[PDB]
Every structure is written in structure tokens, then in C-alpha cells.
């Protein structure tokens, strides 16, 4: 039971993510940009997985079923409030975004505010703090 079983996966590759097999599953699947601690814990509670295992002890069938629940939010009764992307201003679909998708969403969004030339975009472009934060004595490491 406690011995490293046959075919224990030291390295996993899923959604272009390096998940280490030695990590505990709830903090293992948390590695990718879009999946945090809370979203990792709710979806591993959804998939009928014992969260007491390491991320290498599971089987590829248990990997795909936790990957499907991940990309299928409302399809397994995860409510509107939990999602990291709710009512997109182009799509209008309430569903979570993951690594490369969210990189596209954020980049398009701040470049959209830049191109409509709303101040948020103008503060983004001129390279200052966006949320009315005092810059008279803060933000010097990033700006020499």
C-alpha cells in the first residue's frame, strides 16, 4: 500500500501542464494557470477520487474523468458564482477559462480597453498601477 506501486507516474502532462506525481492531488492539479486551491478541491470532490492519494497512484481513466469535470463546469452542477470567467462581454457564456485560453482573454481584454482608449487601457499602456494606487512613493523595483 505505502510502497511506490508499479507504473507510478513521476511526471504528468495534461492541458500542456507539468503536474508532479509526488504532489498531493488537490495541490498537484492546482499547478496550471486557471486552477487554484478552491477550484482544485471542489472538482476533485466532484470526481469520485480519494484526495488522500499522491498524484501518481491514480490511473489514466481517473485522469480523464477529473479532466472532463474540470472543462465541464455547469455539466456536473458547479454553480454560476464559482467560475473564474462569468458573463464574457463577447460570448455571454458563464464558464471557467484555463492557461492558454485565459492568456488570450486577459491580453485581448486590456488591449480592447487600450483600443477603445478607456483610461484603464491608457494606464496599462503608459505602464502605471491600474486601480488608483498612489505611485508617488511605490512601484520602483519594476520601474528601475
Amino acid at each position: 500500500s505505502l510502497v511506490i506501486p508499479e507504473k507510478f507516474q513521476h511526471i504528468l502532462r495534461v492541458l500542456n501542464t507539468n503536474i508532479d506525481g509526488r504532489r498531493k492531488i488537490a495541490f498537484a492539479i492546482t499547478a496550471i494557470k486557471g486552477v487554484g486551491r478552491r477550484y482544485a478541491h471542489v472538482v476533485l470532490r466532484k470526481a469520485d477520487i480519494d484526495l488522500t492519494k499522491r498524484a501518481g497512484e491514480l490511473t489514466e481513466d481517473e485522469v480523464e474523468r477529473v479532466i472532463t469535470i474540470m472543462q465541464n463546469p455547469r455539466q456536473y452542477k458547479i454553480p454560476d458564482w464559482f467560475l473564474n470567467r462569468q458573463k464574457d462581454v463577447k460570448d455571454g457564456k458563464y464558464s471557467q477559462v484555463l492557461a492558454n485560453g485565459l492568456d488570450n482573454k486577459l491580453r485581448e481584454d486590456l488591449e480592447r480597453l487600450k483600443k477603445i482608449r478607456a483610461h484603464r487601457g491608457l494606464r496599462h499602456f503608459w505602464g502605471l498601477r491600474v486601480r488608483g494606487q498612489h505611485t508617488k512613493t511605490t512601484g520602483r523595483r519594476g520601474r528601475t
Binding site: R37, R38, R45, F82
Partner: protein
């Protein structure tokens, strides 16, 4: 014989939460496997059957100090909201969790919507509380 106050309360609540789970018919809500217990807490409870523990916790809290409504349950189930970079502050519990636990114990013959507000512990409740107290003390014997 012995009563509820004559045994270690650390073993009592686990015994009573198990006792309620041996019944296993506690009108448990839908969103149990997605919810965070307070907006001062960060993660969902480590354990999966946190509802039966809290039901038994509320139950013995009404036993010891009765006439307690949902607002005193949010007070008693409070902790630090460590505000990140700003200093920590006392914060309350989730009103929904406390209310639904009492409504579960109301539907079951243990508590009663009490005059002067809040919930009492009814004679069947007190009986089941006092008998398991004897079972836990006789077990620790």
C-alpha cells in the same frame, strides 16, 4: 450515573456526530460539497462529513446554553479574517450553515422554535444527549 458535563467534550461531539450518522437521515442540503464555512475561512473543510459534526456541535451548544438563535451560532462559530497585508479582524460564520443545521434539528425531534426567539433542546434531544454522554464515559472507563 453520568451526564453530558462529566465527560471530555473532544470525544463527545465525534461520538454524537457518528451517532447521528448511524441514523444517516439528517435532511442535509445540496451544496455541501462546494461551500466554504465562513468568509473569514479560505478552503472547504478537510473532512467530508462536516455537517454531522456541526449539527452535533450546535446540539450540545443548545444543551449547555439554550435560547440561542442563528446570530449567536454565527458569533460562537467565528475566527480571525487575517486581511492579507492589513492586520487580522474577528469575523462571523456563514448564516446559511447555522440556520439549516437548526432547521434539520427542528424537523428532527431534538430542538423547538423557542419563545423569546432561538431554539431550545426538547426532552428527546436532552435524553439522546445524556445517554450518549454515559456511553462515551463508559467507553473511556
Amino acid at each position: 450515573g453520568v451526564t453530558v458535563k462529566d465527560v471530555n467534550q473532544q470525544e463527545f461531539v465525534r461520538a454524537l456526530a457518528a451517532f447521528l450518522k448511524k441514523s444517516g437521515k439528517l435532511k442535509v442540503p445540496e451544496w455541501v460539497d462546494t461551500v466554504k464555512l465562513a468568509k473569514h475561512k479560505e478552503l472547504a473543510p478537510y473532512d467530508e462529513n462536516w455537517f454531522y459534526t456541526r449539527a452535533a456541535s450546535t446540539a450540545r451548544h443548545l444543551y449547555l446554553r439554550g435560547g440561542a438563535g442563528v446570530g449567536s451560532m454565527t458569533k460562537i462559530y467565528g475566527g480571525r479574517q487575517r486581511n492579507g497585508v492589513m492586520p487580522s479582524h474577528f469575523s462571523r460564520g456563514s448564516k446559511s450553515v447555522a440556520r439549516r443545521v437548526l432547521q434539520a434539528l427542528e424537523g428532527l425531534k431534538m430542538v423547538e422554535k423557542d419563545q423569546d426567539w432561538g431554539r431550545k433542546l426538547t426532552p428527546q434531544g436532552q435524553r439522546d444527549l445524556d445517554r450518549i454522554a454515559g456511553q462515551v464515559a463508559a467507553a473511556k472507563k
